[PDB]
């Protein structure tokens, strides 16, 4: 099937927190600090 | 006019797809003008900080100590100075913090174990040239832009002419696209350039995946060149990140990825092996004919030569 293929493509090429500009979410101090 | 060639880029996330496209604009176009380079100044600063933070956080999850107990505060400073700075703004204090952290032996020890967690392959690049990036009059070199990592908004397409041919290179990056959009990419595609990150052989698999990027890539590549609907579509293999693979093969044996491998831990013998693992997935020794290439997507000189070779192959098939 082609659906299976498209599905596979979507999950394999699917993108995280290291793209674009900064976000207030990426600036949260890790727990050990 | 003459002829028009349609190319489609496939390959798992972080395999070098977007990089290849950005290479074409540099090689077979006008590249990035001084002005265009200034636009990425913001994202360059970002990726840099995003990388160092990624390593620091790893130190907590891997239970790694700092080489110098003084760096502890700097780590805190990092998030504060980064929580407080902005775009197009690089304080000498922030760069100093990032720099000292990037030097710390403990941080390095973590950086060396970057296989045990997810980390971009532009980290070392920027973190090394920090002194240059930090400069006030700093303007991102053409190679810098090449290394930038931005949010892929849907499907990208780049036009360019090379050897009297009109190339249209498509790349669906990250954006989950519906069955409909995909069809329009596979249709009329002169050749598929499937990209594989060689350095993904020794990575510790995620907690949500059932194998690993390498095998995932193999499973993907399999269905691709074995799908009857792609019969007339020429398959081109781009074993990418050869440079990183070479540095990894020194300390990380290929056995971690392919247990049944009884060859020596050399770049030459291992890379040849990986190629075979992919090419052997082609259940058409007679019909299909895979064109493999060992590339470094960030190396312009390389890419230029590789693509030139690819071009000829396409012209020949007439
Ligand atoms: N050292 C090295 N780095 C690479 C190579 N190819 C890609 N990268 C880096 O990997 C990062 C992500 O690659 P990218 O093209 O965005 O992956 P994709 O778009 O998901 O296919 C980029 O920022 C590049 O700097 C390579 O051949 N060698």
Rg (CA), chain B: 21
Instruction: Specify the CATH number for the domain of residue B196.
Output: 3.40.50.300
The answer to whether the annotation marks B14 as part of a ligand binding site is: yes
* A and B: number of Cβ contacts within 8 A: 88
Separation between Cα atoms, residue B59 and residue B50, nearest integer Å: 15
Which helix (H) or strand (E) segment holds residue A12: the answer is helix A2-12
Judged by CB atoms closer than 8 Å, whether chains meet at A21 and B46 is answered as yes
- Ligand 1 centroid – CA B16 distance (Å): 4
SS3 at position A23: coil
Given the structure tokens 């000292």, which residue do they identify?
Answer: B100
The answer to whether the annotation marks B122 as part of a ligand binding site is: yes
Give the DSSP letter of residue A33: -
If asked whether residues B121 and B179 sit together in one domain, one would say: no
Interface-testing mutation among A7, A8, A22, with chain B (most B C-beta atoms within 10 A):
A22
C-beta separation of B11 from A13 below 8 A: yes
If asked whether residues B27 and B141 sit together in one domain, one would say: no
**Pick from B151, B180, B200: which residue ends a domain?**
B151
If asked whether residues B26 and B86 sit together in one domain, one would say: no
Find the closest chain A residue to B17 by CA distance.
A13
Beta strands B155-162 and B234-240, pairing class: unpaired
Which helix (H) or strand (E) segment holds residue A8: the answer is helix A2-12
Which residues, in sequence order, are CB contacts of B195 under 8 Å at separation 6+? Answer: B9, B10, B11, B15, B16, B17, B20, B238, B240, B297
Q: How many domains does chain B have?
A: 2
Judged by CB atoms closer than 8 Å, whether chains meet at A21 and B87 is answered as yes
If asked whether residues B142 and B246 sit together in one domain, one would say: no
Strand partners, B195: B238
If asked whether residues B142 and B281 sit together in one domain, one would say: no
If asked whether residues B249 and B303 sit together in one domain, one would say: yes
If asked whether residues B162 and B293 sit together in one domain, one would say: yes
If asked whether residues B279 and B164 sit together in one domain, one would say: yes
Report long-range pairs for B86-89 (Cβ below 8 Å, ≥24 apart): B87/A21, B87/B42, B87/B45, B87/B46, B88/B41, B88/B42, B88/B45, B89/B45
Separation between Cα atoms, residue B203 and residue B140, nearest integer Å: 30
CA distance B145 to chain A (A): 13
Q: Which of B305, B313, B119, B261 is nearest to B197 (CA)?
A: B119
CA distance A31 to chain B (A): 8
C-beta separation of B59 from B110 below 8 A: yes
Report the 10 Å Cβ neighbour count for B172: 22
If asked whether residues B76 and B207 sit together in one domain, one would say: no
- φ and ψ at residue B138, rounded to 5 degrees: -60, 130
Report the 10 Å Cβ neighbour count for A32: 12
If asked whether residues B156 and B301 sit together in one domain, one would say: yes
Instruction: Specify the CATH number for the domain of residue B85.
Output: 1.10.400.10
Largest Cα–Cα distance in chain A?
50
Identify the contact set of chain A against chain B, taking CB-CB distances under 8 A: 2-6, 8-10, 12-22, 24, 26-33
Separation between Cα atoms, residue B185 and residue B5, nearest integer Å: 13
- Ligand 1 centroid – CA B108 distance (Å): 21
Separation between Cα atoms, residue B304 and residue B23, nearest integer Å: 8
Report the 10 Å Cβ neighbour count for B273: 16
Which residues, in sequence order, are CB contacts of B305 under 8 Å at separation 6+? Answer: none
Torsion over CA: B26, B28, B34, B38 (sign): negative
Judged by CB atoms closer than 8 Å, whether chains meet at A9 and B12 is answered as no
Look up the domain containing B133 and give its range. Answer: 33-151
**Pick from B105, B133, B151: which residue ends a domain?**
B151
Our answer on whether the CB atom of B156 is closer than 6 Å to any ligand 1 atom is: no
If asked whether residues B145 and B251 sit together in one domain, one would say: no
Region of B7 (left: φ > 0; alpha: ψ -120 to 50; beta: rest) is beta
Q: Which of B64, B68, B46 is nearest to B123 (CA)?
A: B46
- Ligand 1 centroid – CA A32 distance (Å): 31
Given the structure tokens 């053409």, which residue do they identify?
Answer: B142
- φ and ψ at residue B262, rounded to 5 degrees: -115, 25
- Find how far residue B8's CA is from the centre of its chain: 16
Separation between Cα atoms, residue B174 and residue A19, nearest integer Å: 11
**Pick from B106, B121, B151: which residue ends a domain?**
B151
Residues, chain A: 33
Q: Which of B208, B245, B281, B176 is nearest to B15 (CA)?
A: B245
Separation between Cα atoms, residue B310 and residue B303, nearest integer Å: 10
Q: Helix B41-61 and helix B105-112: axis angle, to 10°?
A: 90
Q: What experimental approach yielded this model?
A: X-ray
Separation between Cα atoms, residue B250 and residue B246, nearest integer Å: 7
Separation between Cα atoms, residue B161 and residue B224, nearest integer Å: 27
Q: Which of B211, B170, B222 is nearest to B17 (CA)?
A: B170
Structure tokens at B76: 């805190």
SS3 content of chain A, % helix, strand, coil (to 5): 35, 0, 65
Which residues, in sequence order, are CB contacts of B163 under 8 Å at separation 6+? Answer: B311, B315
C-beta separation of B168 from B211 below 8 A: no
Beta strands B155-162 and B165-172, pairing class: antiparallel
Q: What is the 3-state secondary structure (H, E, C) of chain B?
A: CCEEEEEEEECCCCCCHHHHHHHHHHHCCCCCCHHHHHHCHHHHHHHHHHHHHHHHHHHHHCCCCCCCCCHHHHHHHHHHHHHHCCCCCCCHHHHHHHHHHHHCHHHHHHHHCHHHCCCCCCHHHHHHCHHHHHCCCCCCCHHHHHHCCCCCCCEEEEEEEECCEEEEEEEECCCCCCHHHHHHHHCCCCEEEEEEEHHHHCCCCCCCCCCCHHHHHHHHHHHHHHCHHHCCCEEEEEEECHHHHHHHCCCCCHHHCCCCCCCCCCHHHHHHHHHHHHHCCCCCCCCCCCEEEECCCCCHHHHHHHHHHHHHHHHHCC
If asked whether residues B122 and B188 sit together in one domain, one would say: no
Residue B36 burial by CB count (10 A; 0-12/13-18/19+): exposed, middle or buried? middle
């Amino acid at each position: 099937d082609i659906e299976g293929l498209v599905e596979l493509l979507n999950r394999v090429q699917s993108s995280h927190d290291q793209r674009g500009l900064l976000r207030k979410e990426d600036l949260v101090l890790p727990e050990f600090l | 006019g003459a002829r028009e060639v349609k190319l489609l880029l496939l390959g798992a996330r972080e395999s070098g797809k977007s990089t290849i496209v950005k290479q074409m604009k540099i090689i077979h176009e006008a590249g990035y003008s001084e002005e265009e380079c200034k636009q990425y100044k913001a994202v360059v600063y970002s990726n840099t900080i995003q990388s160092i933070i990624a390593i620091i956080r790893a130190m907590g999850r891997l239970k790694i100590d700092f080489g110098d107990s003084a760096r502890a505060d700097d780590a805190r400073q990092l998030f504060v100075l980064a929580g407080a700075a902005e775009e197009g703004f690089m304080t000498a204090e922030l760069a100093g913090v990032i720099k000292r952290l990037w030097k710390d032996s403990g941080v390095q020890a973590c950086f060396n174990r970057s296989r045990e967690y997810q980390l971009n392959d532009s980290a070392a690049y920027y973190l090394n040239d920090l002194d240059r990036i930090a400069q006030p009059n700093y303007i991102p070199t053409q190679q810098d832009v090449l290394r930038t990592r931005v949010k892929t908004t849907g499907i990208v397409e780049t036009h360019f002419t090379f050897k009297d041919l009109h190339f249209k290179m498509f790349d669906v990056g990250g954006q989950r696209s519906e069955r409909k959009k995909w069809i329009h990419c596979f249709e009329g595609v002169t050749a598929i350039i499937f990209c594989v990150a060689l350095s993904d052989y020794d990575l510790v698999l995620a907690e949500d995946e059932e194998m690993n990027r390498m095998h995932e890539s193999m499973k993907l590549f399999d269905s691709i060149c074995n799908n009857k609907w792609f019969t007339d579509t020429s398959i081109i293999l781009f074993l990418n990140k050869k440079d990183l693979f070479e540095e990894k093969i020194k300390k990380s044996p290929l056995t971690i990825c392919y247990p049944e491998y009884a060859g020596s831990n050399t770049y030459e013998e291992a890379a040849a092996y990986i190629q075979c693992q992919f090419e052997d997935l082609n259940k058409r020794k007679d019909t299909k004919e895979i064109y493999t290439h060992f590339t470094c997507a960030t190396d312009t000189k390389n890419v230029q030569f590789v693509f030139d070779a690819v071009t000829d192959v396409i012209i020949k098939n007439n």
